[PDB]
Ligand SMILES: Nc1ncnc2c1ncn2[C@@H]1O[C@H](CN(CCCC[C@H]2CNCc3c2ccc(Cl)c3Cl)CC[C@H](N)C(=O)O)[C@@H](O)[C@H]1O
């Protein structure tokens with residue numbers, strides 16, 4: 001409701017520089033949040049238990065790092081966002097247009113930790129080839145992609161990072177949004193959920209956005225109540241040097257959940 | 261190697277003051293059980309939920325590095341008939357002794373007992389819980405987790421134990437990560453194969469006050485804890501993190517969060 005108007009002033013390039021340029025975007029320190037997120041995803045896909053033909057990324061924003069390890073396990077990938085200015089920034093990177101964001105530091109680091117000898121250009125090439133479409137989405141609607149969408153449903157897997165808690169006024173609408181995106185997932189399919197812990201605001205240029213502050217326990221309970229078995233749930237505590245003025249995040253959680 | 265760091269630990273703890281330690285961590289604001297987002301309730305919930313699965317039971321339990329605290333055995337004591345408590349410091353073993361004798365001027369744990377009864381959901385009154393705990397504590401022993409035999413040779417303890425509980429001991433007495441790992445291997449010799457270890461500890465902490473004692477700690481992370489448990493021959497069944505909120509980031513320590521691990525020895 002009120003989240004809708006706040007996001008109308010969201011600046012993609014301000015969000016990217018706040019969260020994916022140095023210091024947070026410096027991947028040289030292995031104790032940083034960037035390396036921790038990439039490791040969570042790489043370790044999960046390296047188990048081999050998360051696989052299929054189609055995958056959907058919920059609330060992509062203007063970022064692609066969350067699919068770097070995913071893309072070699074799913075041949076049809078749908079990226080999504082509420083904002084068209086983000087879908088446009090995504091398109092600029094998928095089509096190698098001018099002004100695209102330079103994700104190569106993240107592709108590089110994903111290649112390092114996967115340990116398959118893959119060069120980073122091949123990783124990026126493969127991600128662009130498998131992202132078939134970039135669609136609008138609204139996780140508040142009981143059909144987040146609308147009716148009859150160009151997206152093959154139900155998907156084998158969902159990935160969502162920093163969306164649900166950032167679009168939800170409180171714990172209850174957070175739980176509904178989770179219920180809503182769960183309708184997109186085949187039984188036995190997997191959810192990879194990344195989110196901020198105990199956060200209440202972040203800035204994106206002129207936009208100041210409200211976040212529901214959630215704990216690890218509340219994330220687990222909410223995944224159960226939506227019908228998931230929780231395969232893994234991990235926490236990163238935000239160090240002082242990554243506490244800038246752009247938000248009040250206290251930590252990051254990673255959940256690997258399987259729909260029963 | 262590292263015998264110097266361990267000699268530094270032993271030395272620092274000769275100034276550990278039990279009553280001052282209890283005030284800092286088990287009276288309000290840290291010891292306030294009314295705030296359901298506080299760290300006291302979170303720890304009690306972790307232990308109560310783990311014992312309510314029915315999967316952690318047996319005859320004998322050892323509490324590793326109890327200090328002068330009993331809260332970590334409140335939910336455990338209905339599932340184990342023989343409990344061994346332990347600590348490095350005799351002043352702590354006397355403090356426990358004062359509470360076992362029900363003396364006035366022993367620390368009052370009844371807020372913790374009441375909270376344990378509340379969340380266990382069995383309608384138990386806190387005075388029956390405390391009576392059961394006092395009955396089932398069969399001995400209070402010196403321990404040193406840096407020794408290959410942390411209880412010493414030919415200890416009174418019934419070994420091997422069916423379960424281990426340890427709250428805030430290993431990371432608070434180890435100068436480095438290698439020491440932490442060796443101390444875990446040592447206490448794991450006390451646990452039977454297939455037995456369970458319940459581990460509570462501080463995350464990313466480098467010091468705390470035991471009144472006047474300002475003692476240094478090796479900061480550990482969740483992933484370091486998980487890896488140490490695997491390296492010791494455990495399967496990790498649960499590893500939860502509590503992030504220390506600002507309103508309880510008093511001057512008592514620089515702790516950033518708390519971990520709870522449920523591990524089973526293979
Ligand atoms: N070589 C050795 N071998 C074996 N045991 C040894 C050896 N050397 C010393 N010891 C024993 O180690 C015990 C450690 N203490 C306190 C440790 C620090 C806790 C503190 C840290 N800051 C964060 C924080 C804390 C507490 C609560 C909360 Cl919430 C938070 Cl956040 C016992 C703790 C008690 N079990 C309990 O649980 O409180 C002492 O008794 C000492 O004598």
Ligand SMILES: Nc1ncnc2c1ncn2[C@@H]1O[C@H](CSCC[C@H](N)C(=O)O)[C@@H](O)[C@H]1O
Pocket residue numbers: 003007010019059060061062063066081082083086137138139140160161162163166167
């Ligand atoms: N109602 C809604 N439903 C789904 N997504 C929404 C939404 N309102 C805003 N969003 C999107 O949620 C995103 C949160 S920022 C998350 C960005 C990216 N996933 C990352 O990992 O950094 C923004 O792109 C915002 O446009």
